[PDB]
C-alpha cells in the first residue's frame, strides 16, 4: 500500500513458518525423550 | 521464488518469452527535441512500456513510497542551479552529471530487467549510452574539470560493458537556432540561460560520436523535425527494421540468465558508481554524510526493510 | 661435515680463538651466500657482473660479521676470567652489529644491530648452558 | 647385450637433458619422441610389452597435438635449436660429461651400490615363472575391469570432467 | 553464615585443585611413556592390514 | 556456465578432497589432489579477463610441479617397500620431499609467493574455496603421515611462514592479498603443531575456516576489495561493522575472542614438548597480524571515512544478500571461547 | 514420438543406428539364455595347476583319481 | 592420540559404550550458553538484513535457539564420552605399569631444610 | 635394476630442474612437466615388472590418464594466454605484481 514495488516479504510465508515451528517442537520433543532415555539407561547400566 | 539458477532450470527461460516487439528502443535528441511525445507514442503504438527520462529524483520515485525525497537525500544536485551558475565553486555541475548518469544506469537496468522478465519491449528517453554528450559539452564549455571528465569515463568503462546495447536508436535532429527558439517558448526561467555554445556542443557530441558509435552495433534511424511529427511514420520504420547487427544476436538462455541475475540485484548494478575515487566534487564529508544517512534512515518507511516498516502499514512482523 | 661446525663447542671460549673465528666466519659466509642467492633469484640485477658483485658483497659482509663476532667473543672470554658468561656473546654480537653498520655506512644500523645481535648471541649462549633445545623432537 | 639396458637408460637421460635445456618446442617434441621410444624399449626389455607400447602410442598422439599447438602459438621468427645457443650447447656437453664423471665417481666410491658397472646386466631380471602361461602385463592392466574397478571409475570420471573443463576454459 | 562455611569450603577448593594438578602432571608422564614405548592405548600408529593377504594355493609352489 | 558444467565441476571439486581423505592408497590420494587441481581452474578462469588468465596459469604451473614431486615420493616409496603407503622404515628423503611438495601445494613459505598473486587475480567467491576448501586434502595427507615427519623441517617452514605472512600483511592495501597472507600465517601455525598433536592442527584449520568464510562473504556483500572501498561500509551497510571488527580481531587472536584458543593451545603443546624458542618467536611475530588487522578495523568501524555523492542511491536501493550462514559462522567464531574445553 | 523418430530415421540415420545398437547392447545380455555360460567357461579354462589337497579321510566328494565320477564335469561345455 | 585405542569403532558419533556415563543435565551452563548464542545469532541476522531486531522473525529465532541447544546436547555428550575414555585409559595404563609411575613418599616439613632468604 | 633406477631418478631430477628454471616459452615448461610424467611412468612400470606385482600395473595407466588430463588443461591455458597477449611468453604474466 505504501510501497510501489510490491514488498518482497509482504506477508509471511506460512509454509516456511509452519515448517520452522514444527521442526522446533519436534526437536524439543525428541530431545526430551532422548534425555529421559539416557537417564534411564545410565541408571540401568550403573545400578541406579 | 527469486529468479535464480533453480527457477531457470525449472523454466523461466527468456528466449521462451521474447517476441518481435520485444526490443530496447532509445529516443534521443537535443534539448526540447520533442523526444517525450515521440517516445510515448511509439510505446503506445507498439504496445511496449515507456520509461520517462531519468531525473534527479528517479531512484526516490521508483523505490519506497514513490514520493520525491528531499534533495539532500536525492543527490544535492540542482539542474536549476546548474543553469543559474554553471561554474559555481561548489561543484554542482559534475555532481548533477554523475547523479544523472547513475540514475540513467538504474533506469537502464530496470528496463532490461523488465524486458528479460515479462518479454515486453521498452522505450527510453536517452540512456547511459547517450549520456556522455552532456559531460563532453560541459567540459568543452569549461564548466567541469578534466579530472571530472576522467572520473566519468572511468565509471563508464566499469559499468557500460556489462549490459546489452539498445536494439534501435531514433535520433531527432533539430538545429541550434530552433532549439533556442523552442527553449524560449517553453519559457523555463532557469532554462532560458542555457547558451547556444552549450547547445551546439551537445549537438556536436551527438552527431560526431554517439551516432557513429551506435550505428556500429544498433540500428540507428535519424528523423528531422518535420519527420518527427506523425509518430506513426516512425512506428512504421521501427516495425520494418531488421536487426541483423548487434551483440543481441549471439545471446542465449544462459547469457540472458546471467544478465538477469546482474540486473535483478540493484546493488550490483550501482556498485561501481561508488568507486572510492576521491574527487572533491562528488566526495562528501563524514559528518555531512552521517547526518544525511541518519535523517534518511528515519524517514517514514525507510528505517527498516520494505516489508518490516510497521509505521507505514506493514503487519505480521512478529512472523515475517 | 657438520663435525667442523660442532667443533665450535669442543673447548670452552677464550681458547682456540683462531679456530673458533674460522668457524664463525664460515658460518657467516654460508648465511651470506644463501641470502645472496635469494636476493639474486628475486629482484634480479641488470648485469651478470652486477649479480656476481652483489653475491660477493653479501658474502663478504656476512663473513665479516661472523669473523668479528667470533674474534670479539673469544677475546672477551680470554681477557676476562669468565669462560661461559653470556655477556661475552653479547659483546661479540654487538661487535657484529657495529661491523654491519660500518659495512652499510649507517650508525642507526650499528646501534639496532648491536642490540639485536648481542641479545641473540647472549640467548644462544644461555641456551647452550641451560640445555634449551631448538627444533625438538616429539616427546609429549 | 650386457650393456643393453644401461645404454638405453643413459639415452633416456640424454633425451631428458635436452628437454630440460628446453630448445624450441619443435625440438622439444622431437626429443621427447626419442625419449618415449627409448623408454618403451626399456620397459620392453624389462619383460613388459603392453605398457611400453601404450606409452609410445599415447606420447605420439600427445606430441602430435603439441606440435600442432606450437606451430600456431609457440613460435618465433628464428627458433633456437640445441646448438644455436652457445650456452645451451656448452651445457649440453657439460651435462653429458658430468653424467659420465658422476657414473665413474659413484662406481668408485660404492663398488657395489646404486651402480655396479662391473656386474652390470647381471641383475636385470630377478625372477620368472618358467612354466607359467598367464603372466602377461596386459592381464594385470585389464584387472581394472574386475579387481580394481575403483581405478577405472576415477580415471573415467577424470576424462569426462576433462571434456567439460576444456570446453569452458576455451570458451 | 559464619567462619565454618568459608573455612571448610576452602578446604574443598584445595582438595579439588590439588587433585586436578596431580592428574595433569600424571597425564604428562603417561603420554610421554606411551609415545616413547608404544605399549599403550594411545599413540598406536597404523600398520598395513593382514585381512587382505591372499593365502590360497598359488601357481608357484615356493610362494 | 551452463547448469551441467556447474554440477560436474562443483561435484568434482567436492569429490577430489573426499577421495584424498577416504583413500588408503597413496596413488588414490594423489588422484584426489589431481581432481581438485584440474577442477578448480575453470572456476578460476571463469571471468576470462587478462588478470584471471594469468592467475590460472600461475596456479596451474605451481600445483602441477607439486603434484609431480609428490608422485615421485610415492613411486620411490613403492620401489623401496613394495607398498603404496608410507611406513616407519621409509627413507627419510621421501618424507622430506612429500612435506616439501605438500607445502608448495598448501602455499606455505618459502613457497608462498604464488598464493598472493592467484588470490588477488581471482574473484572473491572463488577465493573462498581457494583459501578454505583446497587445504583440507593436503593437510589430511600430512596428518595421515604425522608420526614420521621431520620436526626441524616443519618448524623451519612454520616459523618462516609466520614471519613472512606477518611482514607481507603490512604493506598490502588489497583485501584479497591481505587474506592470502593471513592464510599463510595460520597455515604456519597449523604445520608448526602438526608433528606433535594433529588434533590441534585440525582445530586450527576449523577455526581459521570458520573465521575466513565469514570475512570473505562480508567482502562479497559489497564486492569490497580495497581498504578504501571497505571504508565505505559505514555508509553502504552500517550494521555489519560490529561483527567485522570482532571477526578481524579474532583472526588476529585476542584473548576474549576465539582466535586465542588455537594459538594459546598450540603454544601450550609446544611448551609441553620443550619447543620454547620457536613458541616464543611465533607468539611474538603473530602480533604484526594484529597490527595489520587493527589498521583495517580503524579504517572501517572506528573511524568514518569520506564517502561519495552516489552512495545515496545505494542507500535508497534494497539489499537481500547476507546469508544465514554469515550470522551463524560469525557469532560461533567470535563468541565461543567459554566452550573451549569441548573444542579440544 | 513417431514424427521426430521418422524424420531422424532419414535425415540423421547414423545417430538412429548408433542409439539403437547401444540400446540393444544393453538389452540383449539380460535377455539371453547363454549369458550365464560365459563365466562358467572362463572358470572351466584351467590356466593354473589344480593343487591336490591332502586326504584327511573325511573328504567325501573330491575324487582320488581324475577319471573318477566325482568332481566337476564339463559335459555342459562339451554340449553347450 | 586416541584414534588407535583398542576397540575404536570408526566414524561413530556416540559409541554404545557411552550410554554408561551420566547424561548431560539439560539446564547445564554449557547448553544455556548455546541457547544464548543461538538467540544472539537470530538477532544478528535480523540486524544485518535490516529487520526489527527483536520483534521480527520469532519463528527464525526459535529455530536458531532450539537448533543450537539440540546440537549442543549431543556434542556435549560425545565430549563427555571422550574425556571419560581418556581418563579410563589413563588409569588403566598407570595401574598396569606401577614400575614407571612409582608413588612418592613425602617427608614432613620438620625434616626438610628449606633455605631461608631474608627479605632485608 | 639399480643402475636403471639411478638413471631414471636422474632423468626426473633433470626434468624437474628444467621446469623450475623457465626460459620464456611456457610451452617448453609444459613439455618438461610432460617429460617428468614419462620418467615417473617408466619408474612405476619397471618396479612393477621387477616385483612381478601384477596388481600394481593398473596404476601406471592411471598416471598416464591423469597426466594427460592435466596436460590438456595446460594447453587450454596456453591458448587463453596467447589470445590475451599475442604470444606464450611468460614475461607478459606479470600483471598481478600489483
Ligand atoms: C577436516 C575435514 C572436514 C572439513 C569439513 C569442511 C570444512 C568447511 C569447508 C570449507 C568451507 C568453504 C565452503 C565454500 C562454499 C561456497 C562458497 C561460495 O563461493 O559460494 C558463496 C555462497 C553464495 O550463495 P548465495 O548467497 O545464496 O548466492 C545466491 C545464488 O546466486 C542463488 O542462486 P543459485 O541457485 O545460483 O545458488 C547457487 C547454486 C549454484 O550451484 C552450483 O553451481 C552447483 C550445482 C549446480 C546444479 C545445476 O546452487 C543452487 O542453488 C542449486 C541449483 C538448483 O555463499 C556460501 O555458500 C558461503 C556459506 C559459508 C559456508 C562455509 C561453511 C564452513 C563451515
Ligand atoms: C564492539 C565493537 C564495536 C564496533 C563499533 C560498532 C559501531 O560503531 O556501530 C555502528 C555505528 C553506527 O551506528 P548508527 O549509524 O547509529 O546505526 C546503526 C544501527 O544498527 C541502526 O540500526 P537499528 O536502529 O535499526 O537497530 C538497533 C539495534 C542495536 O544494534 C546495534 O546497532 C548495536 C550492536 C552492537 C552492540 C554491542 C554489544 C556489546 C557486547 C558487550 C559484551 O537494536 C536495538 O536497538 C536493541 C537490540 C539489542 C542489541 C542488539 C544486540 C544483537 C547482537 C548481540 C551480539 C553480541 C556480539 C558480542 O558506527
Ligand atoms: C541467560 C540466562 C538464562 C536463564 C538461566 C538458565 C536456566 C537455569 O536456571 O540454569 C542455570 C545454569 C545451571 O546452573 P547449575 O549448574 O545448576 O548451578 C551451578 C552453577 O552453574 C555453577 O557453574 P559451573 O561451574 O558448573 O559451570 C561453569 C562453566 C560456565 O560456562 C558458561 O556458561 C560461561 C557463560 C559465560 C557468561 O564454565 C566456566 O567455568 C565459565 C568459564 C568461561 C570463561 C569465562 C572467561 C573467558 C573470558 C570471557 C569471554 C566471554 C565470551 C565472549 C564475550 C563477547 C566478546 C565480544 O547456570 C546458568 O545459567 C548460568 C551459568 C553461570 C556460570 C558463571 C558465569 C560467569
Ligand atoms: C558444546 C560445544 C559445542 C561446540 C560448538 C561449535 C564450536 C565452534 C568451534 C568450531 C571448531 C570446532 C571443531 C574443533 C575440531 O574439529 O577438533 C578437531 C577434531 C580432531 O579430530 P581427530 O581426533 O584428530 O580425528 C578425527 C578423525 O578424523 C575421525 O574420528 P572418528 O572416526 O572416530 O569419528 C569422527 C566423529 C566426528 O564427529 C563430528 O561431527 C566432529 C565435527 C567437529 C566440527 C564441529 C562440530 O564422528 C563422525 O565423523 C560423525 C559420525 C556420522 C555418522 C554416525 C553414524 O577434528 C575432527 O574431528 C574433524 C574431522 C572430521 C570428522 C568427520
Ligand atoms: C634449514 C637451513 C636454514 C637456513 C636459513 C638461512 C636464512 C637466510 C636469510 C634469509 C634469506 C633472505 C633473502 C634476502 O636477503 O632478501 C632478499 C630479498 C630482498 O631484496 P634485496 O634488497 O635485493 O636484498 C636485501 C637483503 N638484505 O628478499 C627475498 O628474497 C625474500 C626471501 C623470502 C624467503 C626467505 C626464506 C628463508 C628461509 C629458507 C628456509 C628453507
Ligand atoms: C646450472 C645452470 C644451468 C644452465 C643455466 C642457463 C643460463 C641461465 O641463466 O639459467 C636460467 C635459464 C634461463 O636463461 P635465459 O632466460 O635464456 O637468459 C640467459 C641470460 N644469460 O634457464 C634455463 O635455460 C634452463 C636450464 C636447465 C638446465 C638443465 C641442464 C643442466 C645441466 C647441468
Ligand atoms: N546539465 C545536464 N542537463 C541534463 C542532462 N540530461 C537532461 N538534462 C536536462 O533535462 C532537460 C530535459 O529536456 P527535455 O527535452 O524537455 O526532456 P523531455 O521532456 O523528456 O523530452 P523533449 O520532448 O525533448 O522535451 C533539459 O533541460 C536538459 C544532463 O546529463 N546534464
UniProtKB/Swiss-Prot annotation, chain A:
Lipoprotein among keywords: no
Any single GO CC term annotated in Swiss-Prot or TrEMBL for this entry: mitochondrial inner membrane
Topology of this chain in the membrane: Single-pass membrane protein
Keyword Mitochondrion appears in the UniProt entry: yes
GO BP annotations, alphabetical order: aerobic respiration; proton motive force-driven mitochondrial ATP synthesis
Compartment(s) where it occurs, according to its Swiss-Prot or TrEMBL record: Mitochondrion inner membrane
Annotated keywords: Electron transport, Membrane, Mitochondrion, Mitochondrion inner membrane, Respiratory chain, Transit peptide, Transmembrane, Transmembrane helix, Transport
Main location: mitochondrion
Bilayer-crossing regions: 13-32
Function: Accessory subunit of the mitochondrial membrane respiratory chain NADH dehydrogenase (Complex I), that is believed not to be involved in catalysis. Complex I functions in the transfer of electrons from NADH to the respiratory chain. The immediate electron acceptor for the enzyme is believed to be ubiquinone.
UniProt record similarity statement: Belongs to the complex I NDUFC1 subunit family.
Subunit structure: Complex I is composed of 45 different subunits.
Protein's name in the database: NADH dehydrogenase [ubiquinone] 1 subunit C1, mitochondrial
Species name: Mus musculus (Mouse)
Curated annotation (Swiss-Prot), chain B:
Family listed: Belongs to the complex I NDUFA10 subunit family.
Keyword annotations of the record: Acetylation, Electron transport, FAD, Flavoprotein, Mitochondrion, Phosphoprotein, Respiratory chain, Transit peptide, Transport
Cofactor binding description: Binds 1 FAD per subunit.
Stated role: Accessory subunit of the mitochondrial membrane respiratory chain NADH dehydrogenase (Complex I), that is believed not to be involved in catalysis. Complex I functions in the transfer of electrons from NADH to the respiratory chain. The immediate electron acceptor for the enzyme is believed to be ubiquinone.
Organism: Mus musculus
GO molecular function: NADH dehydrogenase (ubiquinone) activity
Subcellular location: Mitochondrion matrix
Record has tRNA processing as a keyword: no
Modified residues (N6-acetyllysine): 87
Name by which UniProt lists this protein: NADH dehydrogenase [ubiquinone] 1 alpha subcomplex subunit 10, mitochondrial
GO CC list: mitochondrial inner membrane; mitochondrial matrix; mitochondrion; myelin sheath; respiratory chain complex I
Gene3D superfamilies: P-loop containing nucleotide triphosphate hydrolases (3.40.50.300)
Matching InterPro entries: Deoxyribonucleoside_kinase, DNK_dom, NDUFA10, P-loop_NTPase
Coiled-coil residues: none
Subunit structure: Complex I is composed of 45 different subunits. This a component of the hydrophobic protein fraction.
Modified residues (N6-succinyllysine): 87, 250
UniProtKB/Swiss-Prot annotation, chain D:
One Gene Ontology biological process: mitochondrial respiratory chain complex I assembly
InterPro entries listed in its UniProt record: ComplexI_Subunit6 (IPR050269), NADH_UbQ/plastoQ_OxRdtase_su6 (IPR001457), Nuo/plastoQ_OxRdtase_6_NuoJ (IPR042106)
Location relative to the cell: Mitochondrion inner membrane
EC numbers for this chain: 7.1.1.2
Superkingdom to which the source organism belongs: Eukaryota
Transmembrane segments: 1-21, 38-58, 86-106, 147-167
Gene Ontology CC terms, in alphabetical order: mitochondrial inner membrane; mitochondrion; respiratory chain complex I
Disulfide bonds: none
Catalytic reactions of this protein: a ubiquinone + NADH + 5 H(+)(in) = a ubiquinol + NAD(+) + 4 H(+)(out)
Molecular function terms, GO-annotated: NADH dehydrogenase (ubiquinone) activity
Pfam families registered for this protein in UniProt: Oxidored_q3 (PF00499)
Sorted UniProt keywords: Electron transport, Membrane, Mitochondrion, Mitochondrion inner membrane, NAD, Respiratory chain, Translocase, Transmembrane, Transmembrane helix, Transport, Ubiquinone
Membrane protein topology class: Multi-pass membrane protein
Function: Core subunit of the mitochondrial membrane respiratory chain NADH dehydrogenase (Complex I) which catalyzes electron transfer from NADH through the respiratory chain, using ubiquinone as an electron acceptor. Essential for the catalytic activity and assembly of complex I.
Family: Belongs to the complex I subunit 6 family.
Subunit structure, as described in the record: Core subunit of respiratory chain NADH dehydrogenase (Complex I) which is composed of 45 different subunits.
Protein's recorded name: NADH-ubiquinone oxidoreductase chain 6
Native source organism of the sequence: Mus musculus
UniProtKB/Swiss-Prot annotation, chain G:
Topological relation to the membrane, as annotated: Single-pass membrane protein
Annotated TM spans: 15-35
Entry keyword annotation includes Glycoprotein: no
GO process terms (BP): aerobic respiration; proton motive force-driven mitochondrial ATP synthesis
Major subcellular site: mitochondrion
Subcellular location: Mitochondrion inner membrane
InterPro entries: NDUFA3
UniProt keywords, alphabetically: Acetylation, Electron transport, Membrane, Mitochondrion, Mitochondrion inner membrane, Respiratory chain, Transmembrane, Transmembrane helix, Transport
GO cellular component, one term: mitochondrial inner membrane
Segments for region (Disordered): 55-80
Family: Belongs to the complex I NDUFA3 subunit family.
Function: Accessory subunit of the mitochondrial membrane respiratory chain NADH dehydrogenase (Complex I), that is believed not to be involved in catalysis. Complex I functions in the transfer of electrons from NADH to the respiratory chain. The immediate electron acceptor for the enzyme is believed to be ubiquinone.
Assembly information from the UniProt record: Complex I is composed of 45 different subunits.
Protein's name according to its UniProt entry: NADH dehydrogenase [ubiquinone] 1 alpha subcomplex subunit 3
Organism name: Mus musculus
